[PDB]
């Protein structure tokens, strides 16, 4: 309703860097809000693309941002009669970023790895890696849970069980309130997908540079399966956290698996031991149900609700024709231990190929009426096809079915405006929570400031 679409703030990265692919708000130890931005095609030292991360201080006028520097050099370690190898070319550093406390986590999901032993090897594969930074202190750490030192032959001989070589750890990421990093790794276990969790404190305290393979003992990874419903499911394509079992001393995980069960798609709600509490199935195959997931209480009863995006959902139209427009599904959490039911509300896109539901961002309470609100991206939506973000306000029965406000991309065609979104943080300290929108195709981020309702 009350985001200001007249006076925006723009931040810009280098041409071709894909600045804005991922973003998040970052509070320093003093509570000053900045914006961390991922730019996964930023050029590294060898003029190869490796990705980069930027830490943008808040300024109404916007502009350019300083880099948050991470080590971009390939590494080699000869140890235990093996040669360990990291490969950072085209790794996509900044394909995800998330901030928690005064720490920033930025991931390179396509970072490759190999282990050589005489004439054999593990195979050069995208295990992914995450980089952690405490900007104020300069501390750095890394987390790469899928790295191994098993040779190719052993997986073949063991029928490719526990195969974490193609994890792409960090493809999605989220941090629990208590400071546990949870990474989505959609290539895990031969493309089933997995989640890897470890406390941030333990990641820092257990990392040392140059070791490359090291134990984070407090970590927990999800499990492999022989159920072909899970095969090529990309479980971990998206991830979120919330409270869904009623016990406030446990955090639950929400995991998107957009190609689950032969491309039907699913989202699952799990406890922290990776035991499934609920499963929501997609409605239409190939719709990519689970592409995006969001958790927020939209109806003011104190119980978290779930929003799921299916950006390629084809709506039924006249004369038995289908139109790809995208769809968002709201599931309100009921009282007690019961199942999440049928969706409470279906929101559906209007512009063909708009990909409505590609990103869904909790906004907090934008209009300050007591109910939390959301923003849904259609990165190729709008009448012009340039991209749109739609705001939906919460209310006692869920969300309103018609948007309160629509933000048309200020960038040219192809910008992917809305592909990344973050809200619920007041960046200018005016008492209303604001929205940041990435447009990686234009290498820019737009900040929308919330203002008093008119």
């Amino acid at each position, epitope marked *: 309703l009350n985001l200001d679409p007249v006076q925006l703030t723009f931040y810009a990265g280098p041409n071709g860097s894909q600045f804005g692919f991922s973003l998040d708000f970052h509070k320093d130890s003093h509570g000053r809000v900045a914006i961390v931005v991922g730019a996964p095609r930023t050029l590294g030292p060898s003029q190869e693309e490796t990705g980069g991360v930027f830490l943008c201080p808040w300024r109404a006028e916007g502009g350019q941002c300083p880099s948050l520097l991470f080590d971009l050099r390939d590494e080699t370690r000869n140890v235990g009669s093996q040669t360990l190898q990291t490969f950072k070319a085209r790794q996509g550093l900044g394909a995800s970023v998330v901030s928690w406390s005064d720490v920033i986590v930025a991931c390179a999901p396509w970072q490759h790895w190999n282990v050589l032993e005489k004439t054999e090897e593990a195979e050069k594969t995208p295990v992914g890696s995450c980089f952690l930074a405490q900007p104020e202190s300069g501390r750095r750490a890394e987390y790469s849970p899928c790295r191994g030192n098993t040779l190719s032959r052993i997986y073949v001989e*063991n029928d490719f069980s526990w195969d974490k070589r193609y994890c792409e750890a960090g493809f999605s990421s989220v941090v629990t309130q208590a400071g546990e990093l949870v990474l989505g790794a959609p290539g895990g276990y031969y493309f089933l997908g997995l989640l890897a969790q470890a406390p941030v404190a333990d990641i820092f305290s257990s990392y040392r540079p140059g070791i490359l*393979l090291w134990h984070v003992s407090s970590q927990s990874l999800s499990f492999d399966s022989s159920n072909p419903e899970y095969f090529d499911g990309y479980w971990g394509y998206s991830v979120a956290v919330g409270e869904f079992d009623g016990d406030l001393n446990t955090t639950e995980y929400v995991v998107g698996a957009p190609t689950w069960s032969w491309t039907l798609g699913a989202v699952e709600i799990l406890d922290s031991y990776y035991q499934r509490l609920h499963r929501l199935r997609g409605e239409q195959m190939a719709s990519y149900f689970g592409h995006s997931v969001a958790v927020t209480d939209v109806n003011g009863d104190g119980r978290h609700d779930l929003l799921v995006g299916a950006p390629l959902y084809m709506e039924s139209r006249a004369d038995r024709k289908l139109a790809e427009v995208g769809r968002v599904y709201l599931f309100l959490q009921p009282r007690g231990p019961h199942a999440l039911g049928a969706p409470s509300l279906l929101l559906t896109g209007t512009q063909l190929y708009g990909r409505f539901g590609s990103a869904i961002a909790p906004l907090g309470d934008l209009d300050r009426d007591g109910y939390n609100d959301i923003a849904v991206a259609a990165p190729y939506g709008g009448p012009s096809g340039r991209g749109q973000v739609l705001v939906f306000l919460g209310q006692s029965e869920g969300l309103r079915s018609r948007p309160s406000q629509v933000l048309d991309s200020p960038f040219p065609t192809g910008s992917a405006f809305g592909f990344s979104l973050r809200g619920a943080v007041d960046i200018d300290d005016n008492g209303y929570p604001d929205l940041i929108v990435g447009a990686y195709g234009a290498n820019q981020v737009a900040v929308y400031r919330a203002q008093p309702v008119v």
Partner: antibody
Amino acid sequence: EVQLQQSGAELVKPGASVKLSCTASGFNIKDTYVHWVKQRPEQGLEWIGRIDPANGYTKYDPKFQGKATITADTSSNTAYLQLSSLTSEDTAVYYCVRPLYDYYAMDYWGQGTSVTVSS
Amino acid sequence: DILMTQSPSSMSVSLGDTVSITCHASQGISSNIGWLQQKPGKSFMGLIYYGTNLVDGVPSRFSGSGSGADYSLTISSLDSEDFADYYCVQYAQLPYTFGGGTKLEIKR
């Protein structure tokens, strides 16, 4: 708190076999490699071999091939060193070892099991 | 196999000294070395891994340095607990191999 708890002093005859145990306290034995190390007063410290208890795969110094056999049971959170066809030269103190952080390191040690071979 | 030549086999020193124990490998081991401590009639405790990294719990008066084939464990300001046996171990290659050890004894 990580602690490797080994079996007591063994006292066996030449030609006999013996199976020493190393039980993990405060952690899961599958977490890291577990190594066995032989100590004598004169010859000093010698690496026997290692096992990954998660999968049971082992490596040995070729000096100990035949003699020593390392196994593990994740159920009982325990690793074992069996020594066969015992002789005077096998009289030593045996330690189980695991790394702290580095996959390949040798940081945490059990208290040692003393073996004596005599008639 | 890689030979680890540890020197000196012993030294008679006093409380408060800075002393150094060196270890020489037969080839380069790119810092894949650990340092170990065995107190009298006791088991072993890890001091250093990967050349320079203190094991959790170890005091900073212990420090590791070196590169290539030549490494050092330095102990600043000797404590009474530091009179003990020390060994290097390399893990650049299987089989892992150890130094012959160094005993710190009391000067008088």
